[PDB]
Every structure is written in structure tokens, then in C-alpha cells.
Coordinates of C-alpha atoms in Angstrom, one line a residue:
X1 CA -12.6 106.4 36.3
X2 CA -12.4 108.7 39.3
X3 CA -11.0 106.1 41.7
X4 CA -7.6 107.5 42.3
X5 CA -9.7 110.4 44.4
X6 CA -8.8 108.9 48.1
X7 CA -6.6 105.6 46.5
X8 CA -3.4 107.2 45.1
X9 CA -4.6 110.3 46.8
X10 CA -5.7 109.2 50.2
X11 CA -3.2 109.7 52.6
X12 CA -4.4 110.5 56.2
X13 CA -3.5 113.8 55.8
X14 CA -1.8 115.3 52.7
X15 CA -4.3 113.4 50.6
X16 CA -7.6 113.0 52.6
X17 CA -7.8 116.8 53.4
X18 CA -7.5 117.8 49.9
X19 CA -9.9 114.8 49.2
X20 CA -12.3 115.2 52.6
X21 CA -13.7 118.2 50.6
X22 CA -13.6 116.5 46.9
X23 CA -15.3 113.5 48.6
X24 CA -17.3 115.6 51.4
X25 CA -19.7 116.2 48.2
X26 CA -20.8 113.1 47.9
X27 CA -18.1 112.2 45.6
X28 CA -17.6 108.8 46.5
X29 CA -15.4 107.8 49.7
X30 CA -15.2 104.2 51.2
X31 CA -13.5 103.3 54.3
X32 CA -11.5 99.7 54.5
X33 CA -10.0 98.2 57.5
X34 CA -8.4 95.3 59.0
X35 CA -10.3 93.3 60.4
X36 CA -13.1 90.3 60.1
X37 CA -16.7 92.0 60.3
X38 CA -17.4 94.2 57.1
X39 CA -20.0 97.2 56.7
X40 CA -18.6 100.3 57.1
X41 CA -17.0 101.6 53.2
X42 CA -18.0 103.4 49.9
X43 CA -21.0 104.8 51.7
X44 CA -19.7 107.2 54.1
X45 CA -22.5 109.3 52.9
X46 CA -24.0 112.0 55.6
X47 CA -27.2 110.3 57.6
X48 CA -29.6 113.1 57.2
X49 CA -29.4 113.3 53.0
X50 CA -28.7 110.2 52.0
X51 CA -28.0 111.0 48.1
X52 CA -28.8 108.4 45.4
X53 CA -24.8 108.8 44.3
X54 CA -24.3 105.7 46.8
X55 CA -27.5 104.4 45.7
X56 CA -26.3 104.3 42.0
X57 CA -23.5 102.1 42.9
X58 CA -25.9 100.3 45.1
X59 CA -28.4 99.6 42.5
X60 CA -26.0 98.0 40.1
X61 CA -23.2 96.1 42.4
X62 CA -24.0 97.4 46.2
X63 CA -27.0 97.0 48.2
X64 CA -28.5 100.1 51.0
X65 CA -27.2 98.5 53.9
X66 CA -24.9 101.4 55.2
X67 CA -23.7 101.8 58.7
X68 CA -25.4 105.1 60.5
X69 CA -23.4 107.0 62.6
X70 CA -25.1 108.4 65.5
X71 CA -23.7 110.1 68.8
X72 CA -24.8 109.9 72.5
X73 CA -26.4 113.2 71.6
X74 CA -28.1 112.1 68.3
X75 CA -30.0 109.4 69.9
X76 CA -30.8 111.1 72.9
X77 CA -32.7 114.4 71.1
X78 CA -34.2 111.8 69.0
X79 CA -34.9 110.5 72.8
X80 CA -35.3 106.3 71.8
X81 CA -32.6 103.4 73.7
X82 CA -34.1 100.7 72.3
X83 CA -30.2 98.8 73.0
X84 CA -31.0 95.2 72.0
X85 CA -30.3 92.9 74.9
X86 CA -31.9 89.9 73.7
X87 CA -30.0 87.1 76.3
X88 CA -28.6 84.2 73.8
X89 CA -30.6 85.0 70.9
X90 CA -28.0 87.9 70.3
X91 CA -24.5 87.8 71.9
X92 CA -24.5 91.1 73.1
X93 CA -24.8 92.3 69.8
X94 CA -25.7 95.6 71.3
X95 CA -27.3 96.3 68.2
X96 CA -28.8 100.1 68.3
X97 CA -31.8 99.2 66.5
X98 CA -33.1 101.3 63.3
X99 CA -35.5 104.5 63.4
X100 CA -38.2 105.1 60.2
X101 CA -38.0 108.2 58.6
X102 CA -42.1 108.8 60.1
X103 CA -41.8 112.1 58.3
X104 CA -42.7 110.6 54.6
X105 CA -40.4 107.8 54.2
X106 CA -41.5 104.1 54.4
X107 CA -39.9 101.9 52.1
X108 CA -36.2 101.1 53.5
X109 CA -34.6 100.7 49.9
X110 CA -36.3 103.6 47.6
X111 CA -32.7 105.7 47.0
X112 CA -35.1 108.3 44.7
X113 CA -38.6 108.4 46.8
X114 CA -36.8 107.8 50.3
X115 CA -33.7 109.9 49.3
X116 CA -36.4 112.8 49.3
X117 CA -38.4 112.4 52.4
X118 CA -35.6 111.0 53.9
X119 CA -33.6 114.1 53.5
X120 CA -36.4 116.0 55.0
X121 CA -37.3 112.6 57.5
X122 CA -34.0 111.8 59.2
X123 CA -32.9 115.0 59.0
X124 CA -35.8 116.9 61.2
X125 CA -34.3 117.7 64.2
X126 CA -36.7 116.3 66.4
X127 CA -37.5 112.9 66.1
X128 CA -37.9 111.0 69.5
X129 CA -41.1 109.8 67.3
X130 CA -40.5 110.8 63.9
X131 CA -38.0 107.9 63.6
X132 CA -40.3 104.3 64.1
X133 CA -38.2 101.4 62.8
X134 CA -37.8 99.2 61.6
X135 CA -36.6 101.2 59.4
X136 CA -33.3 99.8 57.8
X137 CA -31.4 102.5 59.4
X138 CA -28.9 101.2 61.8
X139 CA -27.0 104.0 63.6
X140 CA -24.7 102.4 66.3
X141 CA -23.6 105.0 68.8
X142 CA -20.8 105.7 68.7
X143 CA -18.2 108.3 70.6
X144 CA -18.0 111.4 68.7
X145 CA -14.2 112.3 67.8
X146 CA -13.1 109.5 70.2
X147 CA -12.7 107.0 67.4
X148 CA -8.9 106.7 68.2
X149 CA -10.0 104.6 71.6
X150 CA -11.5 102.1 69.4
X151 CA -10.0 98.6 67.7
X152 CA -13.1 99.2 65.6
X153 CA -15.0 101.4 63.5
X154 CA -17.7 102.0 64.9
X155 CA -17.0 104.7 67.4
X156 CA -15.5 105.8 63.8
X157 CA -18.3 106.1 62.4
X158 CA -20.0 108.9 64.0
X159 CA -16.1 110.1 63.5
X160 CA -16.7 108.9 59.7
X161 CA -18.6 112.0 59.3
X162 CA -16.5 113.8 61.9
X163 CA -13.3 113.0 59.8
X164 CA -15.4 113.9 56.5
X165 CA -16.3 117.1 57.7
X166 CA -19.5 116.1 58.2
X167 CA -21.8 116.7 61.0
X168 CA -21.6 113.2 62.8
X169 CA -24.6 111.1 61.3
X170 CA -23.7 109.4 58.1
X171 CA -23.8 105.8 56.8
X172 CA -21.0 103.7 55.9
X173 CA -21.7 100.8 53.7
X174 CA -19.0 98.3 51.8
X175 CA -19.8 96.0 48.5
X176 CA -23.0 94.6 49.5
X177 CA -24.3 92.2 46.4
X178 CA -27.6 90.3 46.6
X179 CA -25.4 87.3 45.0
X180 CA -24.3 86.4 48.4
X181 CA -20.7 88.0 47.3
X182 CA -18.1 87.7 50.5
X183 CA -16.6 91.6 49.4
X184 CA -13.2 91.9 51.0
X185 CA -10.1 93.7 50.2
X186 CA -9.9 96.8 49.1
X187 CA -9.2 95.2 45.6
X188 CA -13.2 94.2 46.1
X189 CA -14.4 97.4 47.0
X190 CA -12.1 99.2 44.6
X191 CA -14.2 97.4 41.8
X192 CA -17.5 99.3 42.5
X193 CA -15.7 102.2 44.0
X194 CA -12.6 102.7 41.5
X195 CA -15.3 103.7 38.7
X196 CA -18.0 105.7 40.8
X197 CA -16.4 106.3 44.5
X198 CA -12.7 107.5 46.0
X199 CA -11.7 104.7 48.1
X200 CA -9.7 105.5 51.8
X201 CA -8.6 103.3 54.8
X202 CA -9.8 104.2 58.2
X203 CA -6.7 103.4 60.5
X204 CA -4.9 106.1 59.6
X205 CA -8.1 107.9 58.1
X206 CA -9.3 108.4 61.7
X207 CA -5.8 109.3 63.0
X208 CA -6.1 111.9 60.5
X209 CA -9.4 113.8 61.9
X210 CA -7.6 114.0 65.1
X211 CA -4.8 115.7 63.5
X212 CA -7.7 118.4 62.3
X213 CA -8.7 119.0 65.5
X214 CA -5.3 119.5 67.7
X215 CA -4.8 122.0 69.7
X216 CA -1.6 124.1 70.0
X217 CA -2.8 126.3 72.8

């Protein structure tokens, strides 16, 4: 089982810099944290090729409900603010509602058809139309680098790719069942991750990217 990759190797930096690049293929990295909402984990996959290697873990104990990281600048060039501000019915949820892959991708859970047009969907370039949700994408802007002003992980998770040398887009998803199963600890997560994913914190996982991009000068 490959899941002492980011757990008895995952140390902000000693262990996630050796494992950002084992785990920055796609090799399985999840994300816990402390706190009471849950998303963000196992998927920290890169938002423009969404591989099926999540997927595979998805399709047997996970579902494709992974956090996308987007920055100010992400949205913009794919030029669409469509912040929910629906009074009451949502409190504040600020939800940065999804885009649809309009290049060749419409089914919102097809890891092998979508994982294809998707690559080639999400990832165009310029999509201020290409992306027409819903699309069961959710990228939640979030400050690129600055995730270390946050008591959350969203401004970490455009800074989920950022700290996985990624280009900031990715998704971020936890054990998401269809059984209605509450995942929590990283004893939860380590069950689907600890045989097909590295699993990693992201307290000091995000102080970590900013310890990658100091500046001595």
C-alpha cells in the first residue's frame, strides 16, 4: 500500500518537497485539517486534467465532488462572477458557482469520457463561454499564495496547487461515499487514501509552500 507517501513522509517541508513531486504526478495526495466543514483532501488533483487516478478511488469508496481552485485571475480570463448572493436561501454561502467544460464535456461524473474532453475543456485558455454550468465544477476563488491569511482552506486551494507545484487550478475532494458516510479523521480518509493516495495535512502543508517561495534578497 503506497500510503506512507505524504503520512510517514509528509512533513511540511522535509517530507512534502520530496513528496510534492512523487504526489505532483497524480500519485495520490489528500489534504486534512481541523476544522468542521469537509471537502478539500485525496483529490488535490490539477483542475485542467483531471486524471481518472482520483476517479478510481472515487468510483469504488469516493465520489467526484472535488473542490476547484480558481484565482482572481482564473475566473476573470474565463470573464464569469456569477457570486451566489441568494438573501436567506443561502447564508452568504458565497458559493462561486460551477462552469461546464462547453468544449466536449457534459456529463459532470464521466472520470474516462469527461477526463478527456475535460482535459482539453477546462483546460482551454479561454473560456468566458466555454465553461456553462452547471457543471459540477465548483472553483471558489481563492487568493493565490496567500493561503497563510486564511482560518480555512479555501484561499488554500488555489494554494493547493500552488503548494503542489501546480499551476493554481486543481480540485481537492475528501471520502465522499454515496452511503451518506460522515468521513472524518484522517483515519477515514487514510482508508481510501492509505491503499491508492499519499495522505498530508494542510496547516503546516500551506506553511510549507510559503517556505518555497521566500525570499532572501
Amino acid at each position: 500500500m503506497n500510503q506512507t507517501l505524504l503520512s510517514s513522509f509528509g512533513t511540511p517541508f522535509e517530507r512534502v518537497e520530496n513528496a510534492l513531486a512523487a504526489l505532483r504526478e497524480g500519485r495520490g495526495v489528500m489534504v486534512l485539517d481541523d476544522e468542521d466543514r469537509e471537502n478539500e483532501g485525496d483529490m488535490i488533483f490539477p483542475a485542467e486534467t483531471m486524471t481518472v487516478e482520483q476517479m478510481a478511488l472515487t468510483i469504488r469508496h469516493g465520489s467526484g465532488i472535488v473542490c476547484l481552485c480558481i484565482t482572481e485571475d482564473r475566473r476573470k480570463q474565463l470573464d464569469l462572477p456569477m457570486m451566489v448572493e441568494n438573501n436567506t436561501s443561502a447564508y452568504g454561502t458565497g458559493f462561486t458557482v460551477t462552469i461546464e467544460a462547453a468544449e466536449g464535456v457534459t456529463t459532470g461524473v464521466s472520470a474516462a469520457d469527461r477526463i478527456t474532453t475535460v482535459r482539453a475543456a477546462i483546460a482551454d485558455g479561454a473560456k468566458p463561454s466555454d465553461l456553462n454550468r452547471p457543471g459540477h465544477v465548483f472553483p471558489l476563488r481563492a487568493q493565490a499564495g496567500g493561503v497563510l491569511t486564511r482560518g480555512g482552506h479555501t484561499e488554500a486551494t488555489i494554494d493547493l496547487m500552488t503548494l503542489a507545484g501546480f499551476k493554481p487550478a486543481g480540485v481537492l475532494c475528501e471520502l465522499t461515499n454515496d452511503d451518506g458516510t460522515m468521513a472524518r479523521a484522517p483515519e477515514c480518509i487514510e482508508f481510501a487514501n492509505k491503499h491508492n493516495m499519499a495522505l498530508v495535512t494542510i496547516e503546516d502543508l500551506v506553511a510549507y509552500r510559503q517556505a518555497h517561495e521566500r525570499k532572501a534578497s
